[PDB]
Design a protein around this ligand. Structure first.
Ligand SMILES: Nc1ncnc2c1ncn2[C@@H]1O[C@H](COP(=O)(O)OP(=O)(O)O)[C@@H](O)[C@H]1O
Ligand SMILES: Nc1ncnc2c1ncn2[C@@H]1O[C@H](COP(=O)(O)OP(=O)(O)O)[C@@H](O)[C@H]1O
Ligand SMILES: [Mg+2]
Ligand SMILES: [Mg+2]
Ligand code: NI
Ligand code: NI
Ligand code: NI
Ligand code: NI
Ligand code: NI
Ligand code: NI
Lengths: 488, 488
């Protein structure tokens, strides 16, 4: 009916946060960075691959379906399978050699920074934030190419006797190669003569080779470890992600338990240098539920102050936290879904003792905040509106290059789908007595146990790129909250 | 009979070590630095002091003899006492205010760096050693004046967010004042009219005000503490001293036990950054025997690899270590004294599990070394000869300004007093079967449990300044031993 009021609030939110970000003195962004590479393969390309491999071996490899890529024949065998069988597929490789072979023999059309940390790192860099300290384990020369040249963006490197911060381009170790994901795309009509058989592809499809090298872990050098307090002293918060690449078993005697214990120490060391620091964790899909549970309960729960996740991820968390039914209700897409999203969010806040849980969905955001939070509900609302604007711009333009680009997102309309979805929640919360019609249309809802802030968002109908928007949403909000709080 | 052979060895030792010191990559020198100030007071000076104080108060202070200087009246009262009574005396002050009053109202004729660390710091600086990292708790602007401007000499300072090494002159905290000792000297015939009484001084005498401020302790900032491994990584050894200023009781709830525990952590942290590091402790007179015992047993014994002390100090250590008789025998000055010195040194090596115990006496040096030492007895002998030469030069010239000054000490004769003292030890050790006449006149004595190196030294008959020679002796030897060992 009236988004005009929401629209004014959006403008106030943008101006206030734009100015306030000057106050953030530094932010440590760590762990999962990688290169996503895309290649559309034609016939001339396939011919060069076959020129590099033995057909007898590939046919033998094809007979026994391979569940991993270790040799260039494994690649071709899987590639041919997914070429003839219509279905798409993702296959992992546990070596960096595969990427190198592909680079030397195939090429890629486009490449882009990937991973939650690397994206947030570049985002906050172009956003003008001071002291963006990124950390990528075993950073390589190629990886650093995909960081941006900003004076405010740094990375730790050891200069023969001292640990120092330099730009990513000047901080790599020549002895490592990078984690790169290859997405291979082919199209209807592709003809290939293999082993005398002729294969023509029925429909468009993509193949994904996902590098998951076992040596890249949630760990850091002793030099860096002992410098945590000095880093923490000089930043206002940290954004931590990538915990999904911890495995149950590591061949060198380590287990998931050891890297949970390491993760928590990293957080505690940071707090040793700055007791007022605020740690955010971006959550994501974690196939293995034993690990998901440890990440949430063992790591995230009492040591982290802020968590960011999408709708589905709330269900993943609830599911391993003892609420199978409520997870089932959020996953169903019907009217009740947003009622279950709300209550679930409220669960996560208490069960995991956090300052704030930020859930970003398609047409709206929902943030539940503890009563002992250092910033006000009004400020939090300013932060979601800002994050909503940043997401509009990034969807419009493909990427944020400056703090001014963000203003283009103010001109994306508040989504009607999202606004009407809140209407369902509005009725529920009013009837519950939790809420008054005035307080909800305000977007600020206060309750003895917690406050909860809901906004409708600006949704782009023909967006340029949908990669890293969710990561962007959580980062932009967390720093906005960091700007708002104060210190002497 | 033949020092000519010793003389050749001295020359070989100097050339070899002179060249080898290039190899020491850094050395951390920490804790006790201070300013020693000397003032000869005439009558015009005393008159200004009385012009600043009330006679009635000083006379009242004089009636009740004061055992500490807290007020400028306390100073004058003690000063007058020691002026009329012939005897010399040392009186402590527990504030830095006393120094300031004296500076503003009295002046001093000469001042010089003092303390074991500060002296060794400047010594190794002028000696050309790379990376001399000094550490003085609550370093002040005046204190830093007395460090020398050498590019190789540094000190830790925190620059608003980062811990860094700068020169002492640029690393002070404007908010601290320095530990300074005032030595006041007066002479026969001094006339002073106080309270109507006239005082004339009978004989020359000095008064010493020794600043012992309770806030200067054997501790360091958290920033520095967390940077120990990075420092240790970049030095080959550390020289630690000043443990004598730990008190039983500290008014803020701390006790000697806490600073022992801190001292040992400092050593362990350093070893975390460099496992091959070698720690030296220079020992000194420690009036309180409970503390002396803790320093030796609780701190020095298993965590330190090298100890340096004078003849008397060996007796102090033996005494609190359970050997009262052997301590009594070294203190007696008779022929047996050097037999007891030897055996005592051997005691200290085993009872305290060290790599080497270096005892420097007036005409000779005695170093007992464990069998698992990283450097050879021959090399050790080179180190004592070098240290003996450095001590000759410093006694000649008052101070070491360059690595070339050391060569002047080669031209100071081997002491006959010292050589003949060894003759007694030679007979004992031969008759003991420990030794063969050839092995002793060689100066290298090997034994199942330990090796022991004895040399005669170069002693100056009209020396310029005898302050810090012993500290110099131990430092020069320890670094010489550090130069000799090897690492990749
Ligand atoms: N066209 C769009 N305009 C604005 N926001 C969008 C658009 N498409 C997706 N989003 C936001 O991006 C989020 C997707 O992030 P998520 O599912 O967590 O994956 P990722 O974190 O990899 O981006 C959604 O929660 C949604 O709010
Ligand atoms: N004239 C001199 N020439 C050479 N060496 C000397 C001379 N006088 C003293 N020494 C050496 O200096 C040492 C004195 O040091 P010590 O008694 O430990 O006090 P400090 O450490 O304060 O100098 C003696 O062991 C002696 O070997
Ligand atoms: Mg996401
Ligand atoms: Mg001494
Ligand atoms: Ni092609
Ligand atoms: Ni450092
Ligand atoms: Ni657990
Ligand atoms: Ni005078
Ligand atoms: Ni540092
Ligand atoms: Ni003890």
């Amino acid at each position: 009916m009236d988004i005009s009021e929401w629209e004014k609030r959006y403008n106030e939110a943008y101006s206030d946060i734009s100015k306030s970000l000057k106050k953030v003195k530094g932010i440590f962004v760590a762990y999962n960075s990688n290169i996503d590479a895309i290649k559309h393969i034609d016939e001339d390309d396939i011919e060069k691959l076959l020129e590099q491999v033995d057909a007898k071996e590939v046919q033998e490899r094809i007979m026994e379906y391979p569940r991993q890529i270790d040799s260039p024949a494994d690649f071709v065998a899987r590639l041919i399978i997914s070429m003839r069988d219509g279905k798409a597929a993702e296959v992992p490789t546990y070596t960096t050699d595969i990427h190198e072979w592909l680079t030397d023999n195939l090429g890629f059309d486009e490449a882009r920074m990937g991973g939650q940390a690397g994206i947030i790192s570049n985002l906050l860099a172009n956003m003008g934030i001071k002291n963006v300290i990124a950390y990528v384990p075993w950073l390589s020369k190629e990886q650093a190419e995909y960081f941006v040249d900003s004076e405010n963006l740094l990375h730790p490197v050891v200069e023969n006797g001292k640990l120092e911060l330099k730009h990513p381009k000047e901080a790599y170790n020549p002895d490592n190669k990078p984690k790169v994901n290859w997405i291979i795309e082919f199209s209807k009509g592709l003809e290939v003569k293999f082993a005398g058989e002729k294969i023509v592809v029925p429909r468009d499809n993509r193949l994904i080779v996902s590098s998951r090298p076992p040596w890249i872990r949630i760990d850091m050098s002793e030099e860096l470890y002992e410098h945590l307090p000095e880093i923490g002293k000089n930043i206002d918060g940290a954004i931590l992600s990538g915990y999904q690449m911890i495995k149950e078993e590591y061949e060198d005697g380590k287990t998931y338990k050891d890297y949970v214990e390491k993760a928590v120490n990293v957080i505690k060391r940071l707090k040793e240098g700055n007791p007022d620091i605020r740690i955010h964790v971006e959550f994501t899909s974690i196939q293995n539920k034993l690990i998901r549970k440890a990440i949430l309960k063992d790591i995230v729960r009492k040591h982290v102050h802020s968590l960011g996740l999408d709708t589905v991820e709330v269900a993943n968390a609830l599911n391993v936290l003892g609420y199978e039914e409520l997870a089932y209700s959020v996953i169903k897409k019907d009217e009740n879904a947003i009622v279950a999203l709300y209550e679930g969010a409220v669960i996560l806040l208490h069960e995991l003792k956090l300052e704030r849980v930020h859930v970003h969905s398609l047409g709206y955001y929902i943030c539940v905040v503890s009563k002992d939070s250092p910033v006000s509900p009004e400020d939090h609302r300013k932060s979601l509106l800002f994050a909503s604007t940043v997401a509009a711009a990034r969807a419009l333009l493909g990427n944020i290059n400056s703090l001014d680009d963000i203003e283009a997102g103010l001109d994306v309309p508040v989504s009607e789908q999202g606004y009407n979805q809140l209407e369902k929640l509005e009725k529920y919360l009013v009837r519950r007595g939790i809420c008054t019609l005035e307080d909800f249309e305000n977007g600020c809802i206060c309750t003895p146990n917690h406050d909860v802030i809901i906004i409708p968002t600006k949704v782009v109908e023909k967006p340029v790129a949908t990669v890293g928007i969710g990561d962007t949403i959580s980062a932009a909000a967390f720093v906005s909250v960091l700007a708002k709080m104060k210190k002497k």
